[PDB]
Symmetry: C2
Subunit: 66 residues, 2 copies
């Protein structure tokens, strides 16, 4: 995909996990990827409607808060 697996695996360990299965980290990472895409889409919409090609912090914030 796009998002590395190792960082997500570590995030699970930071959430309290003693051990994390390879597939568990991959799955979460995959889900985070589609979630990112979902939010990104709204972000791109906010930019296009502003007559902008560049997506800024303001677009992302609004996208996450939807």
């Amino acid at each position: 995909g796009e998002l590395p697996i190792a960082p997500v695996d570590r995030l699970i360990r930071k959430a309290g996990a003693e051990r994390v299965s390879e597939q568990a980290a991959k799955v979460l990472a995959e889900y985070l990827e589609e979630y990112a895409i979902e939010i990104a889409k709204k972000a791109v919409e906010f930019a296009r409607h502003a007559g902008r090609k560049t997506v800024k912090v303001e677009d992302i914030k609004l996208a996450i808060k939807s």
Copy 2:
């Protein structure tokens, strides 16, 4: 934090972004980081009550749809 900015930036682009401000990508990456942890904490709980120290796919799947 943990998750890299570059991959996130690329996801925004694959969502339709022609240009993405470094900050925009960074903030989305940090939010995804915060979200994964929240999901992960729930995953550790299912695992713990199952008597397991290793977080599995079944745990992540349930934490995601909460």
